[PDB]
Design a protein around this ligand. Structure first.
Ligand code: T4F
Ligand code: ZN
Ligand code: ZN
Ligand code: ZN
Length: 305
């Protein structure tokens, strides 16, 4: 039994990707873009009214296993697309003009593990040579300042960069998909938790992006929009300046592919519950996050390139 207001296990999310697609065939198609270490299909939903030569926004959730609110958000986004297409001006315009590639759970093996064995697991579930320590941080596994300071070379560490860039099947599947569709993809959005931040490049080094002023202004406006609903306070800025060095991230990698609107969202809360955000907060968190995501989407539509 799936519910948008509860955390759903992988079997339930997987069944949902199939069912939401079949229920909405003129708005959603589903593909598998690869398989995980343990052989699970990595599903991707293409959300939008089909048309020729459409630009796209790519959004992933569940790079990190324990960040359950992220997984919940990708589901919420699809919920909103199907519920409000035809009923609300902006969502209607968005789905007509753009496609959204929504990857609801990247790190499926890790997600399963948080349901079965260890709620606080972060990494993938792949094995490592010379140790019994398991897993790689997919968000240190992309080929962008790969495995520099802010990632660990120790396979037993939570920020382990992996044996090589894109060593993880999951990372490679995502990067291959974006490389294959690069000319259409205009924005990259990665959903995480917690701490209430909107981050943009760079995180792999202390440097500001070419369009820093534009991204600063856009993040500032998105944070402002988010706050309108419940007064939730987000901070924002370049990743290395606002958060910490975190090389090998999907956002920096996408940016250096030429996707100039690239953001990481770290959702609620600020540490009271942390990763173990109560189900009672799913609705409010997803609804306010929708406002930021739609603001960014509208901006991208107005500044195509
Ligand atoms: C294992 C750690 C000790 C190491 C530093 C703190 C950790 C707990 C962990 N960070 C997290 O879990 C954060 C949430 C914590 C942030 C600090 C305050 C407490 C919460 N979530 S995250 O992994 O999704 N952050 C993304 C940002 C990357 C943006 C550019 N790509 C990422 O790092 O990939 C990394
Ligand atoms: Zn994360
Ligand atoms: Zn809503
Ligand atoms: Zn402008």
């Amino acid at each position: 039994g799936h519910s948008y207001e509860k955390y759903n296990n992988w079997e339930t999310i997987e069944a949902w990707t199939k069912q939401v697609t079949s229920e909405n065939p003129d708005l959603i198609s589903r593909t598998a873009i690869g398989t995980t270490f343990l052989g699970n299909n990595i599903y991707l939903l293409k959300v939008g009214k089909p048309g020729p030569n459409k630009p796209a926004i790519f959004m992933d959730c569940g790079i990190h296993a324990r960040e359950w609110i992220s997984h919940a958000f990708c589901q919420w986004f699809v919920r909103e697309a199907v519920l409000t297409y035809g009923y609300e001006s902006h969502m209607t315009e968005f789905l007509n003009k753009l496609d959204f590639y929504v990857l609801p759970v990247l790190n499926i093996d890790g997600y399963i593990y948080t349901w079965t064995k260890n709620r606080m697991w972060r990494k993938t579930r792949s094995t490592n040579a010379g140790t019994t320590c398991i897993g790689t941080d997919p968000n240190r596994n992309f080929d962008a300042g790969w495995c520099t300071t802010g990632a660990s070379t120790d396979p037993c560490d939570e920020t382990y960069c992996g044996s090589a860039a894109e060593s993880e099947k999951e990372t490679k599947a995502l990067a291959d998909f974006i490389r294959n569709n690069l000319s259409s993809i205009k924005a990259y959005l990665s959903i995480h938790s917690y701490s209430q931040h909107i981050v943009y490049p760079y995180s792999y080094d202390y440097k500001l992006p070419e369009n820093n002023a534009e991204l600063n202004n856009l993040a500032k406006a998105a944070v402002k929009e988010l706050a309108t609903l419940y007064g939730t306070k987000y901070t924002y800025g370049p990743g290395a300046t606002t958060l910490y060095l975190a090389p090998g991230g999907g956002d920096d990698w996408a940016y250096d592919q030429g996707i100039k609107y690239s953001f990481t969202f770290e959702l609620r809360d600020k540490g009271r519950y942390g990763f173990i955000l109560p189900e009672s907060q799913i609705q409010a968190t997803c609804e306010e996050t929708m406002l930021a995501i739609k603001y960014v989407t509208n901006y991208v539509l107005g500044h195509l390139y």
